[PDB]
Subunit: 490 residues, 4 copies
């Protein structure tokens, strides 16, 4: 549309934004007043990166978030645990002096040795088994590049292709290679059980998932560790991060096992070439739309806003295109955590997402998704469809769903309605869990047993929050989930 | 056409070699010498862009000699040359000592049109004397690349009073933007006329990137100058293409008029981003590109496409998707500015842009893209356009590898390009300046022959070259398009 | 489909036939045993043509039909009154001798005169006012053809274009001309009120409708004559017959006023040229599908079966194409009434209709109709849509609707579901009224107040009639009509 | 394209003159003389059909002379000539005295293969000696145009026992049908071979309607005869088209094989209606027509199309829709049998069929019909087919009035016809027999020239004639299709 450029974005659209915003917490927004600012700017989920920090540091941040939650009772804030995961780092050298590198020049599994310019160490014990002859290795996030020449029993020789400067204990990438480190170590075990399960968080961002069995392994740890919840298994969500090629190869199995997916473009950018990232992003998002599971696009989405009040023109389109691709969530990393403009970063991402949503042709998007699902479908999914179609046919303002699990709210979100999906539930854990579901606003109630009562309250609260007026239609969906009804707002 | 193999199976060299999206590179200190210009060609540069908002005719003339010397060292390449005008602009005045001033949020700042007065914290001057009549109450006025945001409180006779929104420190002679307002300054002043006539027309460049086009009348003014000045072309008017730069809302509002009048369009995202909210850029880009596709006019997406690569050998993830999406939006050309002109990694920037473009093209569903365009074009069409899109459908229906067009002007090649065939378009022409002109046309490669009078000889010569260049194999089909003595379409077999 | 030729038509499809069959009653099938045969062959509505016969003759036929109804309680038979309507006939001659005609040779409004070879009479008093100079006139159903030469005050001269033989008091047609006779005369007044309203029939086939005002005139007579129903206005259906060009010109207004439409091809064939009939048929049917009102295709649909056991190959396709065009009803005239093979005529029409219905692509047909309706729609029509879509998405066997008026049953029929539409109602007048609705089977019950009870009975009766098995899904629709539910068959 | 004006606004004479659907007329007593044959041409007859299930070579030769004499009296018309073979058939035997027999429902009737035995109520004879091995237990056996329905109880060695279903009276030598069964009789016997070689090939007819084709092998047998007999064509094999008649379920089952092998298809609805349930005819028609459209082979819809018009000057309403729907189904030709051969109103029958066909064509959405066919054809296609459908799309895109094809065989004209253009196809050829061959091709008109060597002369001559025939006006566009020396498509303007 042409007038969509000239006519400004209305306050109604930005307030009723559907794409969820995951803000990473850091020194720039660690206190309570800053987190309230992020909620006002439009935060959906708070992300805690356990790659750095300790339990005591993150626990104080957890208390700040929850204090910010009570200050804004009308909003709902999810809390995510992002694990460090498996990691590959180089060894020590002098250890003081950093070794100089040159083109045309080794690596050993013996981690306890003083590495020189001729030879270095590696923490990954199965380095030679993974890398074959010819395969490349990237020390210090792509600043140093080498190729595998020989494959020894306890070592692997390689020839450099650039004059690097660093370094001591820098990271490593094995592009196009399987990493046989355990998905969850003792550090991660301690993070998932004694923090995520202990303090009852909503999401686990599982780093470096390479297959379906890695998700099952995390799923097993949750069931086994029911000692912070009195034997009751947690409903915590498993968001698998696809950080390398192996995850991309086994994406279908990973997607089936996991609750959600994060397209971790940062590490993917180090593993696959830059030309492939947009393809990887669009394809994985599309499959998550078909599967009916929330997807997250993350990393370098507005990174220039770390140093400035306004983003670059490439970042402007990147957010918009992520939403147009069908991304349920968009994440900020250093923009919120380490940046000097966290409120602007969230503000700009909120407004661009909202604009992108007004440029979606929902009628066409519905049938694009509807045709992608094989028939016959289960009853709840048939009801979910009809709710979206009926909402359009009568021009309803809201789709109200009664749900104890939140699953019905996700089913309706799958078919991408233009209306806001109002989820009615009994426990706050489901409401926080639906902060990665696109276009869902949750009302927590004392009970959801009597339908007519719940529907009347939901409509009343929606009317107070200015999401519907008298006479307007609303699609109600609940059990006799096998029932759909069209109701008028009093 | 997006799937699993598109990620795991690496990008072929035949895909990057046969890239359709054209790459415009801004020339500057980082790539001003002959060695570098040859480097840019090998990495995929289609057009060299000379920015005349800086430098003088002497410095630019040396750069021109270097570009053309680089072209002689790569005779199998064709490089077009673009003149980018300075255009009209608004600057702040001078300051007491200067000696910058410190402004604060909530402050009431005055902006005077008296350009000779020494400015201070309370009051500064502006070079644009029609500032009060261009601005309304509540209008936003940006100063110094958006650093200082101010809002209009009262309008005077020769001054304006604004409310400073943010605390910043401004110096002397800093640029100014008026979001949502028309600027009443000549698009072509005396310096611009000198650059157009005594450089672009004189030394025979191929494109004029016309800055700050606000309406179709602006394009006609440039059109009038080209027709009135034939001093350097022995009487015959130049065929230089006019690429209009849409930089503000006025250009966006009058886009259809501008597009009709112009030979091409540049979505100048940089200045648009200052003149319009950041939420509107992606919309403004996608819409203007779509309209250009429907009009058959080449569009250029510009500015901050790989901005981080100015001081890094690897692009941002947002930049990695920005380039790809511009191609998928239907953009004919993509541009580099600081990345090539004054960055540390110009050859990487052109490489990354080239490989990302090529990968984006392999994800296009061409049959769907063809019918989308064909349906959007009003019927009935003229004869050449009907032949052009028949060449595209025929090419698909026989699985031809090349579409060959004999063309005196290049217009047929542009018509074929409009309907976005998967196969490479071979334009056969007699004039080198026509080949240079087609360097902003997506998916066109051009052979310059000594004559194009005999159709059979041109096609055989074209097929022989194309076969030698690995663009076709023996027994493959090619579509040939020309005139009886353009209205004819052949299907020919490669010998 | 190719195997659709080799594989025979199953008994399930013919039993669950959706297109309704209107049989005209006559000497060949006037008795009770014959009417039972017609019901067994698949009659939906019995048609009584009041162009001939008297009240005493038709009343005995009415008693025979209703006795045939009681003999087959599980089936439902509608009863239609087809009026004589306005008519144009020539005058007397000798009156004995019939006058010979020749090419190159008048007509007078003075009906009381002995017509010769030079001049004839006409019952239509406004003959000269209707026909202008040049317009053609057709005496004796197209056997004699003339053109209007002069237009006198009480007469109109015309020149013949064929050597005719007849005749005394033969019929007349004014192709492309408005006939200003009253839609309902004293004969028709007596038929509608003292037979249709008296004995409480289900349908009125209104002959020779030329505009919307003609239907209103009949609609006024029903409201005025409430003296055979104790002051309660009848719910009798008005089926307008488009028998000439004027009806075709004002079709939209006629269609809005009337309940249904009959494409009376017989008289249309005399008024418009043969090339136009298929266009007239397809266009009018299509508009009736969009309007959501039942349409009937009638006349010469299997006329060769009057003299033989099997039809001609042109008649074979005609029935099939009428169903594929979207006709709710198909009618037999002389095939049932005067033919020597009424049971075969009905049998062949039943099987061909059933085959045509199996060759319909319902998914595509739904969206063809769905897109034709403007949005936003009323709540009941939104529920009607979702019922049809949901039935397809879960592969339900039946669509059960609770309706007191029958209107909801017609709304679901509008969107052409592959499933049989089971209408649940309290009065038999609605069930008989739905015998012109495509694909509807009505269950009459004692009450329809408690939904759960009605749905259980409907499912139980459907299971007994072998229309659904245990575990199969069924779409239920009723009030809180604003509700849709998917239920399993016990 | 169906609406209000399509009913009220009458059928134009330009629509009936430029009718695309071809009309086949069976010749007989009602139209055997020269006067009548000229009448059929004026009313719209495209092909004259000679039915060789009756008459002898002498009587048919007189009819042929009359057809060709009628063609000389209408030189601006082109009339193709069709030979319809008798084919294999099954008859009952003789009866005691004969002296018909009276059969009753429930009776057990015996059918013997001993053809010399005198038949009675209990037992009759059959000319088809493989009757027992063709029929199975429960198979239906019809006798005397379906009058006697019987069902097989027991199968013997030289006999069959059937249960009579209905009470009827059968005479001597009445026809027999075996629904769902293959008949193992030669499709071409000695009489058929005599009619094909010593009449069809001898007197140079254009079409062989091959009766009772059950598989592709049957078509090849006829194909073998044409190649083996060149006595009357000086060594060169005849170009007579083979139109296979699908009359039973076996032909329906093996349709794809038959269609591939044949030059055209006739949906012989008459015998199909006896061999298959009446519910299946419309399906069998629509499906076979669709497959023929996709294959590019002309299909003919036949029998009882206007049956009532045998003894009436006006058709039935079912007949009025039957013709229209056959055209809308995509049928190239429609046929008349008794209506023309031995009816009272042959000239009315051809008139009504012509006007109804033309009206049906005006309701076709040609763009939709084009894309439906184009999508159903597997890609990649050969060069001539790609050019052909480019001619159709080009014609639409410039709003051309005619598509002109220079063709030595007529194959290009048939390829263009396949994609169903709204504009008339002008086939330009040197051989009158090619023009006659195209008389079963929908929407093709053909000019016979003395030479087609010079492309420019042929097109100019074509345009001049077409302009004179009111098929195009000055300045209108026409698509010209031919070969360089078929692979070329021109867009030309009418002078």
């Amino acid at each position: 549309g042409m007038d969509k450029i000239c006519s400004p974005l209305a306050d109604n659209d930005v307030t009723q934004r559907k794409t969820q915003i995951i803000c990473t917490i850091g020194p720039s927004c660690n206190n309570v007043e800053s987190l309230i600012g992020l909620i006002d700017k439009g935060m959906s989920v708070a992300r805690l990166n356990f790659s750095h920090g300790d339990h005591e540091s993150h626990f104080k941040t957890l208390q700040n978030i929850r204090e910010a939650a009570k200050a804004r009772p009308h909003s709902t804030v999810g809390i995510m645990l992002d694990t460090k995961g498996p990691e590959i780092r180089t060894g020590m050298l002098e250890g003081g002096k950093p070794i100089e590198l040159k083109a045309g020049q080794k690596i050993t599994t013996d981690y306890s040795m003083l590495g020189n310019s001729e030879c270095i160490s590696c923490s990954y014990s199965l380095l030679p088994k993974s890398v074959q002859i010819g395969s490349t290795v990237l020390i210090a996030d792509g600043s140093l590049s080498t190729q595998v020449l020989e494959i020894g029993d306890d070592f692997i020789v390689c020839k450099v292709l650039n004059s690097v400067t660093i370094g001591e204990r820098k990271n490593m990438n094995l592009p196009g290679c399987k990493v046989h480190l355990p998905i969850i170590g003792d550090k991660d075990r301690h993070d998932i059980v004694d923090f995520a399960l202990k303090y009852n968080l909503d999401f686990i961002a599982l780093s470096f998932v390479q297959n379906g069995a890695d998700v099952q392994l995390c799923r097993q740890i949750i069931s086994e560790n029911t000692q912070y919840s009195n034997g009751i298994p947690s409903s915590i969500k498993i968001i698998s991060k696809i950080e390398n090629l192996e995850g991309v190869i086994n994406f279908d199995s990973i997607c089936s096992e996991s609750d959600g997916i994060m397209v971790a473009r940062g590490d993917l950018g180090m593993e696959i070439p830059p030309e492939k990232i947009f393809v990887a992003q669009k394809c994985m998002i599309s499959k998550c739309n078909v599967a009916g599971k929330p997807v997250v696009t993350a990393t370098q989405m507005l990174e220039s806003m770390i140093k400035s009040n306004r983003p670059t023109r490439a970042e402007m389109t990147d957010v918009a295109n992520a939403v147009l691709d069908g991304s349920d969530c968009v994440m900020l990393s250093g923009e919120t955590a380490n940046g000097a403009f966290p409120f602007d970063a969230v503000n700009v991402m909120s407004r661009v997402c909202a604009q992108a949503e007004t440029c979606i042709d929902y009628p066409v998007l519905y049938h694009a998704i509807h045709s992608s699902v094989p028939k016959p479908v289960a009853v709840p999914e048939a009801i979910a469809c009809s709710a979206v179609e009926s909402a359009h046919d009568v021009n309803a303002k809201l789709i109200i769903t009664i749900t104890e699990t939140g699953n019905t709210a996700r089913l309706i979100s799958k078919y991408r309605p233009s209306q806001t999906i109002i989820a009615c539930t009994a426990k706050p854990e489901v409401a926080r869990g639906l902060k990665i579901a696109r276009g869902v606003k949750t009302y927590v109630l004392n009970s959801i047993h009597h339908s007519e009562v719940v529907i009347s309250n939901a409509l009343a609260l929606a009317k107070e929050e200015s999401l519907i007026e008298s006479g307007d239609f609303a699609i109600a969906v609940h059990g006799v989930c096998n029932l759909m009804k069209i109701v008028r707002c009093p």
